[PDB]
Amino acid sequence: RIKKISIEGNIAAGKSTFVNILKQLCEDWEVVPEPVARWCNVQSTNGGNVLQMMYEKPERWSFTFQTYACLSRIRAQLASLNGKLKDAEKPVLFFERSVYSDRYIFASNLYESECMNETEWTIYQDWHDWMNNQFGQSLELDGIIYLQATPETCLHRIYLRGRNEEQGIPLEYLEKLHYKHESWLLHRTLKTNFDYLQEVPILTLDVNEDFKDKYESLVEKVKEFLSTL
Amino acid sequence: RIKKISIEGNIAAGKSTFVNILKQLCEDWEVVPEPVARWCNVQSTNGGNVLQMMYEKPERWSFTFQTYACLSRIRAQLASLNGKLKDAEKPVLFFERSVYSDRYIFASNLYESECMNETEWTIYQDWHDWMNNQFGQSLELDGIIYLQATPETCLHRIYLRGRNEEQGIPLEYLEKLHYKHESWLLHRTLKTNFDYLQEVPILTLDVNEDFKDKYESLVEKVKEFLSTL
Ligand SMILES: Nc1ncnc2c1ncn2[C@@H]1O[C@H](COP(=O)(O)OP(=O)(O)O)[C@@H](O)[C@H]1O
Ligand SMILES: Nc1ncnc2c1ncn2[C@@H]1O[C@H](COP(=O)(O)OP(=O)(O)O)[C@@H](O)[C@H]1O
Ligand SMILES: Nc1ccn([C@@H]2O[C@H](CO)[C@@H](O)C2(F)F)c(=O)n1
Ligand SMILES: Nc1ccn([C@@H]2O[C@H](CO)[C@@H](O)C2(F)F)c(=O)n1
Ligand SMILES: [Mg+2]
Ligand SMILES: [Mg+2]
């Protein structure tokens, strides 16, 4: 009943900027931001900052981070499905990233960079499979919007936002994440364990230009994509 | 419908020995062993040994271990509830430990020994609360059997079994775990977040003497305890 659309993109590509203009185009649209605040101030439902711990020593903290990040995403996405959107006329829920980018882009890249060992990567995949088996269907996607930007543009945008934890991220790391996005969503050559994803419709939007000038043409392309689903 | 009973006890107190004689006293009784094999050979559903990793460097690996241990226990306990025991006449399921000892004895002791930091302990408790909120009621206990033995007796029994990963465990560690068992199950002064546990019936059995001589009197006490539930 609720249509579910994931907004995917590299660090600082403009997912939140792009989301912050959606709700005003239709009252039946809702957004689930990445729960970054559960990540920088770890609290039970002045805590530790597990995002910062991972960037300071990724070989120590990537497994713990990646596991918490994805559990907290599932909880937030489930809370939105089962809230007041449930009773609108033509409901659409836009997710800032998905459980699929958690595993196939970020967790995978850290394992390949030796920031998780074989044991951690096995436990992580086991946990991910199981959590999706319990909640997979309620969260299944109807479509994906890819906000495509160069790694160099992303590096400039990290500087523009000034989020403290991200200021040390090097271009080399953003470029690794870029090539995983391109494999998954442009070339569609990245293989996953979730067969339906190979056919899910994708809308690719180039967001390298200034948002102020590109806004109107982006909106039209989104409105048209959504008509097809 | 299924009565659920947890067998609790220190490392090498005799839980498996005690369990290995239950099924022969009644065809409607079943056992869920601690899934130690998922722990010493980590495999998706020749892997790493996460039990050994924790004992070699507990400050590095306790969070990862404790989280996997408890997820794997819940999965194994749920698989037994939803299997063929479901359709017996007077079904009883005996669990080798519970999600409550995972947190209030083992994970808690590691945090107090600085083998998990504040961030890890917060994430762990959050995960535990949430997992029990989804599966708590199906796994709720009707009774507890405490197999009580001195830490010194346990240390001798580690030597008798010869499980490779346990041979380095010092008496000081077993004694910490002993005093947590005594607080929870003898004195009943250990406070948890699960109000019903303070009234769950407990049968305490002293198992310091040789099993061969004590067997018959233990069985009678178990049969009588179970009549009361
Ligand atoms: N298309 C764009 N043109 C100019 N600035 C942008 C554009 N997209 C994002 N920004 C800016 O770049 C930074 C990162 O944007 P943000 O939406 O926080 O990215 P994300 O949510 O993808 O991490 C912010 O300073 C934001 O104003
Ligand atoms: N009451 C007992 N008397 C003599 N040996 C015991 C007794 N209980 C356990 N054992 C022995 O002690 C070791 C540990 O027993 P086990 O059942 O594996 O403990 P647990 O399951 O609690 O770790 C084994 O060698 C076992 O034969
Ligand atoms: N599975 C995920 C998801 C996101 N992130 C990181 O979270 C920060 C906020 O987007 C960004 O710094 C980030 F995207 F990289 C991550 O490391 N792993
Ligand atoms: N939550 C738990 C449960 C058990 N264990 C450990 O597992 C081994 C097999 O009982 C024993 O070495 C052990 F009991 F200590 C643990 O460290 N934490
Ligand atoms: Mg954002
Ligand atoms: Mg045992």
Experimental method: X-ray
Q: How far apart are the first and last CA of chain A?
A: 12
Q: Where are the beta strands (DSSP E) in A79-188?
A: 92-96, 143-148
Name the fold adopted by A1-229: Rossmann fold (3.40.50)
Residue A35's closest CA among A97, A127, A110, A107?
Answer: A97
Query: Do residues A158 and A11 touch, judged by C-beta distance below 8 A?
Result: yes
SS (H, E, C) chain B: CCEEEEEECCCCCCHHHHHCCCHHHCCCEEEECCCHHHHHCCCCCCCCCHHHHHHHCHHHHHHHHHHHHHHHHHHHHHHHHCCHHHHCCCCEEEEECCHHHHHHHHHHHHHHCCCCCHHHHHHHHHHHHHHHHHHHHHHCCCEEEEEECCHHHHHHHHHHHCCHHHCCCCHHHHHHHHHHHHHHHCCCCCCCCCHHHHCCCEEEEECCCCHHHHHHHHHHHHHHHHHCC
What is the amino acid identity at position B50?
V
Q: What's the rounded Cα separation, in Å, for the pair A2 and B14?
A: 53
Structure-block tokens of residue A128: 């991910």
| Resolution of the experimentally solved model in angstroms | 1.9
The CA–CA distances, whole Å, from B220 to A69, B7, B22, B226 equal 50, 16, 12, 10
Q: What's the rounded Cα separation, in Å, for the pair A75 and A77?
A: 6
The domain limits of chain A are 1-229
CA B57, distance to chain mean position in Å, is 22
Residue in A42, A119, A125 closest to B122 by CB:
A42
Nearest CA-CA distance, residue A71 and chain B, Å: 8
Q: What's the rounded Cα separation, in Å, for the pair B122 and A93?
A: 30
3-state secondary structure of B146: strand
B47 touching A, CB under 8 A?
yes
3-state secondary structure of A26: coil
Q: Token match 């509830």: residue?
A: B81
- Using CA positions, which residue lies closest to atom 2 of ligand 4? B102
Q: What's the rounded Cα separation, in Å, for the pair A70 and A50?
A: 13
Query: Do residues B175 and B154 touch, judged by C-beta distance below 8 A?
Result: no
Q: Which residues of A touch B41 (CB under 8 A)?
A: none
Q: What's the rounded Cα separation, in Å, for the pair A176 and A178?
A: 5
Tally Cβ neighbours within 10 Å of residue A78.
Answer: 14
Nearest CA-CA distance, residue B47 and chain A, Å: 7
Structure-block tokens of residue A45: 């439902």
Query: Do residues A72 and A42 touch, judged by C-beta distance below 8 A?
Result: no
**Could you write out the DSSP letters of every residue in B55-90?**
HH-HHHHHHHHHHHHHHHHHHHHHHHHTSGGGGSSS
Residue B34's closest CA among B97, B125, B89, B108?
Answer: B97
Q: What's the rounded Cα separation, in Å, for the pair A217 and B199?
A: 65
Tally Cβ neighbours within 10 Å of residue A159.
Answer: 12
User: In angstroms, what is the C-alpha Rg of chain B?
Assistant: 17
User: Residues with beta carbon < 5 A to ion ligand 6?
Assistant: B 15-16
Structure-block tokens of residue A90: 């033509």
Residue A209's closest CA among A80, A17, A74, A64?
Answer: A17
What is the amino acid identity at position A105?
I
C-alpha count within 13 angstroms, C-beta hemisphere, residue B171: 5
Query: Do residues B49 and B40 touch, judged by C-beta distance below 8 A?
Result: yes
What is the amino acid identity at position B114?
E
Q: Which ligand is nearest to the CA of B102?
A: 4
Helix axes A58-81, A118-139, angle to 10 degrees: 10
Ligand 1: does its nearest atom lie under 6 Å from the Cβ of A177?
A: no
User: In angstroms, what is the C-alpha Rg of chain A?
Assistant: 17
Chain A CA closest to residue B60: A60
Query: Do residues B206 and B12 touch, judged by C-beta distance below 8 A?
Result: no
